[PDB]
Paper text:
The deletion of P1Tth-Lac extends from Met295 to His303 with an additional A304G mutation. The protein crystal from the P1Tth-Lac mutant laccase is distinct from those reported for wild-type Tth-Laccase. The final model at 1.6 Å resolution shows acceptable refinement and stereochemical statistics. The majority of mainchain atoms have close superposition with the greatest deviation localized to residues M293 to P312. The region with the most structural discrepancy corresponds to the sequence (G304-P312) immediately downstream of the nine deleted residues of the β-hairpin (M295-H303). As would be expected, the shortening of the β-hairpin sequence resulted in the loss of antiparallel beta-strands and the flexible β-loop that covers the substrate channel. It appears to have destabilized these residues (Q307, G308, P309, S310) and their polar contacts normally present in Tth-Lac. Higher B-factors of the residues downstream of the deletion indicate increased flexibility (Q307, G308, P309, S310) that were otherwise more ordered in the Tth-Lac structure. P1Tth-Lac shows no significant changes in the residues that coordinate the CuT1 site (His393, Cys445, His450, and Met455), nor in the residues proposed to bind the ABTS substrate (Tyr288, Tyr232, Arg290, Met355, Asp390, Met 391, Met354, Lys424). It shows the coordination of all four Cu atoms by their coordinating residues, and they align well with the Tth-Lac structure, suggesting there was no disruption of the tertiary structure or the active center.
Laccases are enzymes that belong to the family of multicopper oxidases (MCOs) and catalyze the oxidation of a phenolic and non-phenolic substrate to the reduction of a molecule of oxygen to form two water molecules. These enzymes have four catalytic coppers, a type 1 copper (CuT1), close to the surface, and a trinuclear center (TNC) formed by one type 2 copper (CuT2) and two type 3 coppers (CuT3). The Tth-Lac is the only laccase that presents a β-hairpin (Ala292–Gln307) close to the substrate binding site and the CuT1 site. The hairpin comprises two antiparallel β-strands (β22 and β23) and a connecting loop of six residues.
Numbering used by the authors: 26 to 295, 305 to 462
Amino acid sequence: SFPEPKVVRSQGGLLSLKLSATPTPLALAGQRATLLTYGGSFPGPTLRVRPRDTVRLTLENRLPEPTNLHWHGLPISPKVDDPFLEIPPGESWTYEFTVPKELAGTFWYHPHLHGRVAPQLFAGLLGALVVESSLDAIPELREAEEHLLVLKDLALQGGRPAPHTPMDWMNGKEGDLVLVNGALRPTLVAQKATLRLRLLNASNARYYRLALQDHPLYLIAADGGFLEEPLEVSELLLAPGERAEVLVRLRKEGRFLLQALPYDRGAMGGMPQGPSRPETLLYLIAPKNPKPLPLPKALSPFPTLPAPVVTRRLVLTEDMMAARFFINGQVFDHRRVDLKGQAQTVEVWEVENQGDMDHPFHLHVHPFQVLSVGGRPFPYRAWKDVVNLKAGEVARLLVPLREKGRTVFHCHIVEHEDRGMMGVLEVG
Ligand SMILES: [Cu+2]
Ligand SMILES: [Cu+2]
Ligand SMILES: [Cu+2]
Ligand SMILES: [Cu+2]
Ligand SMILES: [Cu+2]
């Protein structure tokens, strides 16, 4: 039985659910531990909705500390997905929103109490949200075997998620248990020859340079929607908070390694030197006499956007020795508004990494089209909400401003966000 979160689906246009955030004893990777969970599980339940559904999610805070919930990737109003809300211990809050028309893909939910994200997310508070689309009914997709792979690492101390050290605040915290759906090196015994894998990097800081032995991956969706047609890749880098959806065509019986290949993201300090080995994430067993489906020739059209009216430059910097991080020379201040834009305009954001470490840049509320990174034209058209920048790279993003209100942009190495790498955008 392949480990995968339980699914809660909308019905009759509504997903109404109470989720408790609570310390939960679990058995994990052959040991006993108490994690912080939504819905009593790690990961939390997958919420599956359709465009136009209403979601009404009551978060009950049964932690000893305040918390809140963020709907990562969902283009909903910041008046609902409010990064400044704090739910005190013992209290509840109801999030209510409508799923946008034409939205599709894998999204996720996690805590977002500013300055206090990294320990909550590391402790196990996360889960996926899938938006089903009409495109999922085409033969080439409908007949695939679908799985969600939540890629999230963990370290334990004293049977609880390990506390943050000073080095953790600088690099972001990685764990030694590199888990898939909360399991250590599970085996997926495929029953069908085409797999549709939804991939979520819900780690604090760990990157996953994914490859499947002997199989290309056919990328069909990025963070925030479908590509226009499948893109064959040999490997796929998922930075923290990124998602993707891929098709895998099992052409031959066998036992295949899905691995996270070595990737140097510019971490510094005390660490083993000498090269890193690939980390096996899962074993994939192909069925007898597999006959895969043909690929879809087309997926969904990417919209032509208006010409942009303004260009913004956001510069990321570091003070690695203080573990403080900055956008345009300042640390986040919840009282300050850094950027002001108009609703129903398009902007170009040039995000420039002037540090030594990779930084995966994220913008709430307003999905963007990546035009280029590092001067290189992006290989597909799809909505994204996280983009990785290596040292010295500039990413050029086309940002349609939709929903009014104040929201945030930040690095999704969540320790960096907590240590200052976040700013505030107001759309009016
Ligand atoms: Cu009914
Ligand atoms: Cu997020
Ligand atoms: Cu977000
Ligand atoms: Cu960062
Ligand atoms: Cu955020």
